[PDB]
């Protein structure tokens, strides 16, 4: 009688889980692995108009409670991911998201013009990255830029799309960002959050930073970011009730996923933990979330989505 | 041969450890325990012109990786901490910092005026809280410039600033550019809690603290990489000032990393709340241990010497 199904965006998802953009989604072999997994969906690596090798290595490092990265958007180029969406993805398995991360509003609109007919025919769904912190400061920490990008994309792209947001840390920013997003009818989902930007890890033995780019500063993922991610999910759930919220950050167990959904998440994305465990993690996360709901008597996610209680 | 001593602000500190403002420093008894502890120094609860009861409880919550709090600046009032600094603190034990967190520039100035006689006579050192997130001036640069100007005109002594965490180099540069205009700012404390996190309990399906719909500042293991980044960012950009590190310290190795990033003093919040003042005995031993394994004899030998990667 229990169900993890999600019915949103004109699609049915078997469960709310998917990878986070950037993790296990850059090559055809990785995307096929995601498609073969039990995840409810998948999303491509954020892509640019041209292929990128990304930053010098080491550019990822495992931390005691998570991860730090300055990948620098290594990706096979937009044409590769468009071809994947248009020709290779098995949509009978699960819906597909494509993440784009052009370096200007014009670069993104040019990609969207070419994505539009493929999205129309095949059903791939756009997620626009406004929060890459490792290349070009983050568009979503500049509200005038943010508004410019959304205007340019909406003019260039006929379909609804979503946005990948950086974490904010005060209600003035939650309100300011929500005010802009609610003014764009095509923004139909908000993904909270990208990594916490520009953390720093130093090794005791070497006395040296652990990644090479940008003097060691890089984005934090994993358990470090979970309370921030929940806060952002719930702040935008409250302020943007006309849009869906996707939760991303710190998900290692079905209990973590349960809390994202209680904060308001429709879909739940998995980044650092998926890098560590591989795509069988989705078998564990569905079983664990179903165990949480069984002990509480819940039969469907809408029985508790967004229903976090106050004291 | 080895020493944890830190010579700054014209004082010799026995070691770099101290409580973080707000932890174990609100009552006469807590201040005494901190003075009796082996800490190199101590700092008072951020105080306000009048007494404050603070937010409705529960307003602190222990987490497995740290803490979330929405205290609400509960404090005995500035007069109490000034009287403590004036008469009751044994300065022969260790130096004393006083934290002030007035709700405007004029409130902070008038407090500083009343504090300046006591600073001069007794040597208490001011830390100006620009980053309280539970009732942040340092997230608005125009306001932070105006606070520092008002303080510098009203206060004839050096002081320091407690900074919120920043998350990109544009904000690091802008904050440093402002701080570097004010020579009376002789130290910068990085960081205050990461603001407006949210924790929910699986069993109750409810937020775990009562104020502000459950949103509050994060401390402890969550914040350590952000704390190190902020310490090092301001160490690089403010070479003419001292950096105090605060954030995620549970062990001597944690303190060692803060010093490599640039910290002169190392403040302890969440771990001290959990462990009590005996933590400073463990922390000095552990840091001396790391130094001994590496042949270091003084903190000046590796403060800020993090290598590239
Ligand atoms: C190695 C790595 C690469 C990433 N690449 C992207 C990316 O291309 N686009 C994006 O929107 N986020 C990217 N992210 C951020 C993740 O999507 C996610 O927002 C963040 O890691 C928090 O989730 P987590 O705690 O499960 O790791 C990347 C994260 C990592 C660790
Ligand atoms: C219960 C509690 C009360 C605090 N009160 C203050 C305060 O009054 N003034 C201040 O500048 N910081 C205050 N802080 C922030 C701490 O000084 C410190 O910046 C933060 O907890 C991060 O350090 P940690 O990871 O070791 O806890 C408080 C933190 C906690 C947990
Ligand atoms: O490619 C990357 O460096 C990257 C992009 C992004 O959006 N987020 C992240 O953490 N890393
Ligand atoms: O009193 C508080 O709520 C408080 C103040 C402050 O500056 N930082 C913090 O975490 N809590």
XYZ file of C-alpha atoms and ligand atoms in Angstrom:
704
model
C 0.000 0.000 0.000
C 3.116 2.196 0.362
C 4.358 4.351 -2.510
C 7.316 6.609 -3.314
C 5.751 7.796 -6.577
C 5.968 11.476 -7.484
C 3.705 13.019 -10.073
C 5.066 16.397 -11.140
C 5.955 18.310 -14.309
C 3.625 16.155 -16.409
C 5.629 13.006 -15.594
C 5.415 10.098 -13.203
C 8.561 9.316 -11.203
C 8.880 5.953 -9.496
C 10.540 7.565 -6.481
C 11.939 10.991 -5.627
C 15.643 10.076 -5.910
C 18.064 11.209 -8.601
C 21.748 12.087 -8.805
C 22.858 15.654 -8.144
C 24.164 17.403 -11.246
C 27.876 16.736 -11.664
C 27.980 13.329 -9.912
C 27.979 10.176 -12.098
C 26.642 11.901 -15.192
C 29.447 13.133 -17.492
C 29.981 10.146 -19.868
C 27.594 7.893 -21.706
C 28.652 4.988 -19.496
C 27.786 6.985 -16.330
C 24.434 8.141 -17.683
C 23.562 4.584 -18.711
C 24.506 3.393 -15.218
C 22.169 6.040 -13.733
C 19.429 5.009 -16.161
C 19.907 1.309 -15.247
C 19.800 2.130 -11.484
C 16.610 2.262 -9.423
C 16.670 6.051 -9.240
C 13.449 7.879 -10.104
C 15.364 10.187 -12.448
C 18.812 11.466 -13.459
C 20.422 14.710 -14.558
C 23.405 15.395 -16.798
C 26.658 17.124 -15.835
C 26.254 20.906 -16.144
C 27.445 21.647 -19.648
C 28.978 24.547 -21.564
C 28.766 25.332 -25.285
C 32.206 23.727 -25.765
C 33.935 20.779 -24.125
C 36.010 21.577 -21.035
C 38.798 19.661 -19.389
C 38.183 21.539 -16.118
C 40.630 22.494 -13.404
C 44.004 20.868 -12.649
C 43.913 17.824 -10.349
C 43.629 16.914 -7.507
C 40.315 18.789 -7.679
C 38.112 16.547 -5.478
C 38.888 15.367 -1.990
C 36.977 13.136 0.453
C 36.512 14.755 3.876
C 35.517 13.090 7.180
C 31.963 14.383 6.776
C 31.640 15.064 3.081
C 33.554 16.398 0.107
C 35.316 19.472 -1.266
C 35.593 20.133 -5.005
C 36.828 22.673 -7.542
C 36.103 20.586 -10.636
C 35.860 23.637 -12.942
C 32.949 22.309 -15.023
C 34.725 19.524 -16.932
C 32.106 18.368 -19.381
C 31.808 16.842 -22.838
C 30.109 19.966 -24.288
C 26.454 20.785 -24.833
C 26.267 18.985 -28.188
C 27.152 15.708 -26.430
C 24.419 16.008 -23.787
C 21.846 17.176 -26.357
C 22.646 14.081 -28.431
C 22.294 11.942 -25.306
C 18.867 13.479 -24.639
C 17.808 13.256 -28.259
C 19.147 9.798 -29.194
C 20.370 7.632 -26.347
C 18.234 8.113 -23.292
C 15.528 5.489 -22.677
C 12.592 7.607 -21.531
C 10.530 4.471 -20.847
C 12.946 3.886 -17.932
C 12.677 7.327 -16.292
C 12.501 11.043 -17.085
C 15.709 12.945 -17.828
C 16.945 16.368 -16.738
C 19.663 18.329 -18.561
C 21.742 20.904 -16.656
C 23.261 23.843 -18.534
C 25.831 26.253 -17.143
C 26.871 28.731 -19.833
C 29.202 31.578 -18.870
C 26.809 34.347 -19.919
C 23.099 34.884 -20.422
C 23.619 34.767 -24.191
C 25.524 31.449 -24.094
C 22.654 29.907 -22.106
C 19.967 31.246 -24.417
C 21.800 29.882 -27.463
C 21.884 26.396 -25.874
C 18.175 26.654 -24.945
C 17.224 27.544 -28.529
C 18.780 24.276 -29.662
C 17.439 22.295 -26.690
C 13.825 23.472 -27.285
C 12.831 21.123 -30.137
C 14.449 18.135 -28.347
C 12.596 18.979 -25.110
C 9.398 19.294 -27.174
C 9.830 15.909 -28.893
C 11.556 13.767 -26.229
C 10.514 15.365 -22.925
C 13.945 16.169 -21.418
C 13.630 18.856 -18.712
C 15.970 21.822 -18.322
C 17.683 22.729 -15.044
C 19.580 26.026 -15.314
C 22.677 26.237 -13.100
C 22.855 29.676 -11.431
C 25.336 28.584 -8.765
C 28.596 27.181 -10.105
C 31.262 28.391 -7.563
C 34.536 27.050 -9.085
C 35.100 28.796 -12.412
C 32.570 34.034 -13.326
C 30.983 34.690 -9.869
C 27.725 32.947 -9.064
C 24.803 34.527 -10.887
C 22.391 33.884 -8.023
C 24.503 35.910 -5.527
C 23.915 38.884 -7.911
C 20.195 39.493 -8.059
C 20.312 41.832 -11.027
C 22.290 39.247 -13.004
C 19.894 36.531 -11.883
C 16.947 38.509 -13.209
C 18.758 39.136 -16.502
C 19.449 35.422 -17.045
C 15.881 34.409 -16.277
C 14.537 37.041 -18.659
C 16.921 35.951 -21.444
C 16.171 32.240 -20.985
C 12.393 32.811 -20.840
C 12.562 34.752 -24.105
C 14.679 32.026 -25.778
C 13.061 28.862 -24.343
C 9.342 28.035 -24.823
C 9.056 25.400 -22.057
C 9.069 25.463 -18.237
C 12.433 24.901 -16.623
C 14.067 24.729 -13.212
C 16.961 26.539 -11.535
C 19.838 25.243 -9.410
C 20.328 27.701 -6.529
C 23.293 28.424 -4.224
C 22.616 28.367 -0.458
C 21.482 31.589 1.162
C 21.968 32.389 4.836
C 19.458 35.094 5.780
C 15.798 35.850 5.262
C 16.526 39.057 3.370
C 18.169 36.954 0.652
C 15.428 34.271 0.757
C 12.809 37.005 0.190
C 14.801 38.810 -2.483
C 15.437 35.590 -4.436
C 11.838 34.393 -4.056
C 10.547 37.765 -5.270
C 12.493 37.413 -8.529
C 11.644 33.763 -9.080
C 7.902 34.276 -8.593
C 7.990 36.846 -11.375
C 8.986 34.202 -13.978
C 6.133 31.813 -14.765
C 8.403 29.420 -16.654
C 10.522 28.641 -13.611
C 8.638 25.603 -12.393
C 11.130 24.109 -9.920
C 13.915 25.333 -7.675
C 16.804 23.076 -6.656
C 18.223 23.879 -3.174
C 21.282 23.653 -2.901
C 24.527 23.681 -4.782
C 27.657 23.306 -2.677
C 28.530 25.702 0.140
C 31.066 27.799 -1.714
C 34.755 28.351 -0.982
C 35.433 26.181 2.058
C 39.084 25.253 2.747
C 40.631 21.971 3.909
C 44.220 21.571 5.069
C 45.997 18.277 5.752
C 47.671 17.891 9.132
C 50.564 15.790 7.813
C 51.393 17.733 4.652
C 50.384 21.114 6.157
C 49.046 21.791 2.679
C 45.637 22.409 1.069
C 44.037 19.244 -0.320
C 42.918 20.469 -3.769
C 45.029 22.388 -6.264
C 42.730 25.014 -7.868
C 42.067 28.448 -6.381
C 44.542 28.191 -3.475
C 42.641 25.182 -2.116
C 39.248 26.879 -1.810
C 36.380 24.768 -3.139
C 32.684 23.878 -2.727
C 31.545 21.746 0.238
C 29.124 18.845 -0.094
C 27.986 16.026 2.116
C 26.955 16.071 5.734
C 28.492 19.522 6.298
C 25.689 21.081 4.256
C 22.555 19.235 5.473
C 21.024 21.840 7.865
C 21.796 24.572 5.352
C 20.168 22.551 2.595
C 17.024 21.865 4.678
C 16.783 25.524 5.567
C 16.941 26.551 1.944
C 14.444 23.919 0.830
C 11.969 25.042 3.468
C 12.513 28.795 2.939
C 11.713 28.512 -0.754
C 8.922 25.981 -0.151
C 7.238 28.675 1.974
C 7.948 31.603 -0.314
C 7.385 30.000 -3.726
C 4.240 27.852 -3.306
C 3.566 28.053 -7.064
C 6.791 26.166 -7.844
C 8.240 22.791 -6.900
C 11.316 22.546 -4.654
C 13.984 19.888 -5.255
C 16.193 19.152 -2.257
C 19.904 18.542 -2.659
C 22.508 18.302 0.094
C 23.744 15.892 2.734
C 21.522 12.942 1.782
C 23.096 9.698 3.032
C 20.091 7.811 4.477
C 16.360 7.453 3.897
C 15.915 9.459 7.122
C 17.824 12.387 5.568
C 15.549 12.068 2.512
C 12.462 11.956 4.755
C 13.520 15.275 6.298
C 14.057 16.952 2.893
C 10.544 15.882 1.884
C 9.096 17.095 5.219
C 10.823 20.473 4.563
C 9.091 20.585 1.167
C 11.197 18.645 -1.355
C 9.424 17.026 -4.283
C 12.565 15.280 -5.727
C 15.639 14.498 -3.621
C 19.089 14.617 -5.253
C 22.155 12.732 -4.102
C 25.713 13.919 -4.789
C 28.659 13.151 -2.482
C 27.108 9.943 -1.065
C 26.454 8.653 -4.623
C 30.043 9.361 -5.595
C 31.169 7.220 -2.645
C 28.727 4.309 -2.853
C 27.762 4.091 -6.543
C 24.298 3.682 -8.038
C 23.201 0.837 -5.688
C 22.710 3.616 -3.147
C 19.250 4.134 -4.637
C 18.171 0.623 -3.595
C 19.197 1.434 -0.045
C 17.642 4.921 0.039
C 14.212 3.760 -1.206
C 14.186 0.873 1.303
C 15.204 3.194 4.152
C 12.663 5.892 3.275
C 9.928 3.227 3.041
C 10.995 1.971 6.477
C 10.547 5.456 7.944
C 7.139 5.793 6.408
C 6.080 2.289 7.531
C 6.813 3.058 11.176
C 4.663 6.224 10.922
C 1.773 4.763 8.907
C 2.384 6.895 5.810
C 1.352 5.425 2.439
C 2.287 8.290 0.096
C 4.812 11.121 0.196
C 2.090 13.781 -0.035
C 0.903 12.673 3.415
C 3.898 14.545 4.890
C 5.633 16.643 2.192
C 6.036 20.201 3.473
C 4.430 19.242 6.787
C 7.350 20.004 9.101
C 5.848 21.216 12.428
C 6.868 24.188 14.527
C 7.096 24.192 18.342
C 61.721 24.047 24.584
C 58.127 24.174 23.157
C 55.652 26.931 24.005
C 52.007 27.673 23.201
C 52.569 31.286 24.162
C 51.069 34.025 21.970
C 52.322 37.557 22.332
C 49.730 39.992 21.002
C 47.904 43.172 21.829
C 50.765 43.872 24.256
C 50.039 40.769 26.367
C 51.657 37.338 26.678
C 48.890 34.742 26.455
C 49.848 31.363 27.997
C 48.287 29.559 25.029
C 45.925 30.480 22.152
C 42.724 28.897 23.549
C 39.653 30.736 24.797
C 35.905 30.266 24.812
C 33.938 31.528 21.856
C 31.720 34.429 22.779
C 28.381 33.257 24.164
C 29.558 29.875 25.437
C 30.085 29.535 29.208
C 30.498 33.249 29.821
C 27.163 34.792 30.808
C 27.057 34.421 34.625
C 29.545 35.309 37.364
C 29.980 31.569 37.944
C 30.725 30.751 34.302
C 33.253 33.574 34.040
C 34.938 32.255 37.187
C 35.090 28.704 35.821
C 36.599 30.040 32.630
C 39.110 32.123 34.630
C 39.998 29.082 36.769
C 40.394 26.902 33.648
C 43.726 26.475 31.826
C 42.479 28.619 28.872
C 44.865 31.296 27.578
C 42.032 33.824 27.799
C 38.245 34.178 27.965
C 35.584 36.465 26.523
C 32.178 37.578 27.877
C 28.744 36.911 26.405
C 27.895 39.528 23.787
C 26.067 42.111 25.845
C 23.527 44.805 25.125
C 22.777 48.100 26.877
C 19.991 46.516 28.953
C 19.515 42.985 30.294
C 17.853 40.546 27.876
C 16.054 37.300 28.689
C 16.757 36.004 25.178
C 14.551 33.893 22.963
C 11.971 31.323 24.105
C 13.421 27.845 24.679
C 14.354 25.308 23.501
C 16.854 27.608 21.784
C 20.018 25.441 21.812
C 20.097 21.925 20.434
C 22.948 19.421 20.404
C 23.439 17.743 17.064
C 25.565 14.705 16.235
C 27.904 16.834 14.149
C 27.531 20.080 16.169
C 24.968 22.597 17.400
C 22.142 24.884 16.309
C 21.172 27.880 18.401
C 18.834 30.809 18.468
C 19.813 32.178 21.883
C 18.595 35.719 21.218
C 21.472 37.530 22.996
C 20.349 36.643 26.535
C 22.705 38.567 28.786
C 22.957 40.320 32.151
C 23.336 43.773 30.513
C 26.418 45.797 29.647
C 26.642 47.286 33.153
C 27.191 43.805 34.608
C 29.992 42.843 32.207
C 31.576 46.258 32.649
C 31.417 45.831 36.447
C 32.881 42.337 36.049
C 35.713 43.825 33.961
C 36.153 46.749 36.363
C 36.266 44.903 39.694
C 35.820 41.112 39.654
C 38.069 39.680 36.971
C 41.451 38.561 38.279
C 43.691 39.880 35.529
C 46.659 38.134 37.172
C 45.133 34.859 35.907
C 44.682 35.805 32.242
C 43.628 38.684 29.938
C 39.901 39.392 29.424
C 37.912 40.237 26.281
C 34.459 41.835 26.427
C 31.987 41.341 23.571
C 29.362 43.985 22.780
C 26.483 43.571 20.388
C 24.420 46.743 20.470
C 21.491 47.088 18.076
C 22.785 50.291 16.436
C 25.951 52.262 15.926
C 25.009 54.782 18.647
C 24.257 51.986 21.134
C 27.709 50.512 20.525
C 29.387 53.917 20.714
C 27.783 54.835 24.046
C 28.807 51.468 25.453
C 32.372 51.990 24.195
C 32.543 55.421 25.830
C 31.614 53.881 29.186
C 34.089 51.052 28.525
C 37.080 53.249 27.654
C 38.021 54.178 31.288
C 37.926 50.492 32.289
C 39.963 49.363 29.250
C 42.639 51.921 30.123
C 42.768 51.118 33.861
C 42.292 47.319 33.771
C 43.185 46.246 30.188
C 39.993 44.449 29.097
C 39.936 44.207 25.277
C 36.846 44.863 23.154
C 35.484 42.467 20.466
C 32.705 44.122 18.447
C 30.035 41.628 17.372
C 29.046 42.441 13.788
C 27.496 39.063 13.039
C 24.673 38.103 15.443
C 22.131 36.174 13.254
C 19.341 35.415 15.788
C 17.567 38.769 16.517
C 24.116 40.784 10.516
C 25.724 44.212 10.129
C 28.759 42.655 8.368
C 26.566 41.281 5.553
C 25.870 44.951 4.654
C 29.134 46.693 3.881
C 27.863 50.269 4.025
C 26.512 49.649 7.522
C 29.684 47.921 8.654
C 31.806 50.829 7.460
C 29.563 53.208 9.423
C 29.713 51.117 12.612
C 33.517 50.984 12.473
C 33.703 54.732 11.875
C 31.392 55.442 14.807
C 33.375 53.121 17.070
C 36.776 54.484 15.986
C 35.604 58.023 16.849
C 34.111 57.067 20.206
C 36.724 54.592 21.486
C 40.338 55.567 22.099
C 41.624 52.006 22.221
C 42.219 49.217 19.724
C 39.473 46.646 19.347
C 38.488 43.613 17.272
C 35.522 42.510 15.154
C 33.621 39.187 15.181
C 32.932 38.433 11.517
C 30.179 36.260 9.921
C 31.287 33.627 7.395
C 31.623 34.700 3.752
C 31.432 32.305 0.816
C 33.113 33.980 -2.173
C 36.186 36.074 -2.935
C 34.143 39.133 -3.922
C 32.859 39.307 -0.336
C 36.298 38.528 1.172
C 37.821 41.415 -0.834
C 35.042 43.836 -0.031
C 35.105 43.085 3.701
C 38.890 43.304 3.877
C 38.962 46.570 1.920
C 36.713 48.084 4.586
C 38.531 46.612 7.627
C 41.886 47.764 6.243
C 40.638 51.389 6.406
C 40.375 51.279 10.205
C 43.738 50.996 12.018
C 42.046 50.666 15.435
C 40.693 47.272 14.300
C 43.664 45.161 15.401
C 42.091 41.724 15.203
C 39.382 39.955 13.228
C 37.593 36.881 14.630
C 36.483 34.350 11.962
C 33.754 33.010 12.344
C 30.450 33.428 13.979
C 27.956 30.639 13.351
C 26.772 29.761 9.831
C 23.438 31.512 9.924
C 19.888 30.216 9.485
C 20.389 26.475 9.184
C 17.359 24.280 9.928
C 17.235 20.994 11.847
C 14.144 18.747 11.976
C 13.670 15.697 14.203
C 12.569 12.545 12.389
C 10.457 11.171 15.263
C 8.554 14.363 16.089
C 8.601 15.704 12.493
C 9.195 19.065 14.177
C 11.945 21.684 14.193
C 14.230 21.332 17.197
C 14.407 24.942 18.408
C 11.421 27.229 19.010
C 12.398 30.735 17.759
C 12.187 31.915 14.152
C 10.405 28.787 12.873
C 13.393 26.604 13.760
C 16.088 28.542 11.837
C 19.292 29.245 13.803
C 23.063 29.463 13.633
C 25.162 26.337 13.122
C 28.338 25.546 15.039
C 30.684 22.623 15.530
C 31.841 20.118 12.928
C 29.510 21.526 10.269
C 31.380 24.813 10.093
C 35.070 23.811 10.199
C 35.952 24.034 6.461
C 34.090 27.363 6.209
C 35.892 28.618 9.318
C 39.309 27.687 7.955
C 38.526 29.370 4.635
C 37.508 32.580 6.341
C 40.518 32.611 8.702
C 42.885 32.125 5.740
C 41.073 34.570 3.443
C 41.372 37.374 5.950
C 44.895 36.342 6.962
C 45.948 36.828 3.313
C 44.023 40.092 2.826
C 44.717 41.782 6.235
C 48.443 41.177 6.891
C 48.519 44.216 9.135
C 45.985 42.719 11.585
C 45.675 39.584 13.723
C 43.107 36.853 12.876
C 41.376 34.885 15.646
C 40.036 31.496 14.457
C 36.671 30.246 15.659
C 34.713 27.303 14.270
C 34.757 23.529 14.527
C 37.556 23.064 17.060
C 37.340 19.754 18.942
C 41.022 18.633 18.997
C 44.580 19.946 19.047
C 44.850 18.953 15.382
C 41.847 21.167 14.635
C 43.606 24.052 16.408
C 46.818 23.293 14.514
C 44.962 23.698 11.199
C 43.446 26.998 12.347
C 46.937 28.308 13.164
C 48.333 27.089 9.809
C 45.501 29.072 8.175
C 46.590 32.187 10.089
C 44.915 32.168 13.520
C 46.650 33.869 16.476
C 44.048 32.893 19.099
C 41.750 29.844 18.735
C 38.217 30.076 20.192
C 36.139 27.028 21.220
C 32.333 27.119 21.256
C 30.285 23.973 20.662
C 32.952 21.527 21.888
C 33.340 23.588 25.103
C 29.560 23.675 25.656
C 29.592 19.856 25.493
C 32.806 19.158 27.408
C 33.228 22.004 29.920
C 36.376 23.885 30.856
C 38.504 20.774 31.269
C 38.607 20.696 27.445
C 41.441 23.264 27.522
C 43.709 20.766 29.328
C 43.095 18.249 26.543
C 43.509 20.896 23.814
C 46.885 22.263 24.945
C 48.304 18.741 25.332
C 47.066 17.705 21.904
C 48.451 20.785 20.152
C 51.829 20.483 21.914
C 51.755 16.816 20.763
C 51.265 17.747 17.119
C 54.047 20.329 17.406
C 56.377 17.790 19.042
C 55.832 15.223 16.291
C 56.746 17.950 13.792
C 59.609 19.571 15.696
C 57.840 22.889 16.140
C 58.815 24.949 19.182
C 56.583 28.014 18.771
C 53.305 28.945 17.048
C 55.103 31.802 15.189
C 56.922 29.116 13.236
C 53.871 28.009 11.325
C 51.054 30.530 11.817
C 49.723 31.232 8.328
C 52.179 28.854 6.640
C 49.583 26.624 4.964
C 51.240 25.275 1.789
C 49.927 25.220 -1.803
C 49.093 22.070 -3.813
C 32.339 16.527 -7.817
C 31.137 17.409 -7.893
C 30.724 17.940 -9.106
C 29.597 18.749 -9.113
N 29.177 19.300 -10.293
C 28.026 20.059 -10.326
C 27.538 20.543 -11.554
O 28.092 20.277 -12.655
N 26.368 21.284 -11.550
C 25.703 21.557 -10.355
O 24.630 22.194 -10.435
N 26.188 21.095 -9.145
C 27.316 20.306 -9.120
N 27.764 19.842 -7.942
C 26.930 20.134 -6.712
C 26.002 18.960 -6.412
O 25.082 18.964 -7.450
C 25.283 19.218 -5.079
O 24.587 20.438 -5.276
C 26.216 19.373 -3.890
O 27.300 18.493 -4.000
C 25.432 19.097 -2.590
O 24.914 17.756 -2.593
P 25.552 16.588 -1.721
O 25.654 16.996 -0.296
O 24.696 15.325 -1.876
O 26.974 16.353 -2.274
C 28.881 19.031 -7.914
C 29.301 18.470 -6.725
C 30.417 17.658 -6.724
C 30.812 17.098 -5.382
C 24.825 28.926 22.451
C 25.712 29.831 21.625
C 25.762 31.178 21.953
C 26.576 32.025 21.210
N 26.610 33.366 21.516
C 27.450 34.226 20.820
C 27.561 35.583 21.183
O 26.938 36.025 22.132
N 28.387 36.427 20.476
C 29.099 35.927 19.409
O 29.847 36.653 18.783
N 29.012 34.592 19.047
C 28.181 33.747 19.735
N 28.140 32.416 19.384
C 28.960 31.954 18.238
C 30.195 31.274 18.770
O 30.971 32.302 19.368
C 31.003 30.713 17.602
O 31.302 31.777 16.675
C 30.207 29.625 16.869
O 29.487 28.776 17.781
C 31.168 28.810 16.027
O 32.184 28.159 16.822
P 32.098 26.586 17.240
O 32.009 25.784 15.966
O 33.281 26.108 18.051
O 30.802 26.465 18.042
C 27.330 31.539 20.123
C 27.285 30.192 19.805
C 26.463 29.343 20.547
C 26.436 27.908 20.148
O 32.102 21.687 -11.998
C 32.180 22.135 -10.848
O 33.245 22.529 -10.297
C 30.983 22.378 -9.944
C 29.889 23.003 -10.451
C 28.847 23.303 -9.594
O 27.853 23.886 -10.022
N 29.002 22.997 -8.316
C 30.119 22.393 -7.799
O 30.221 22.154 -6.642
N 31.154 22.096 -8.651
O 22.780 35.120 21.222
C 22.758 34.492 20.140
O 21.670 34.052 19.701
C 23.957 34.345 19.216
C 24.684 35.453 18.894
C 25.724 35.347 18.011
O 26.408 36.320 17.749
N 25.952 34.150 17.452
C 25.186 33.037 17.736
O 25.388 31.946 17.238
N 24.191 33.168 18.641
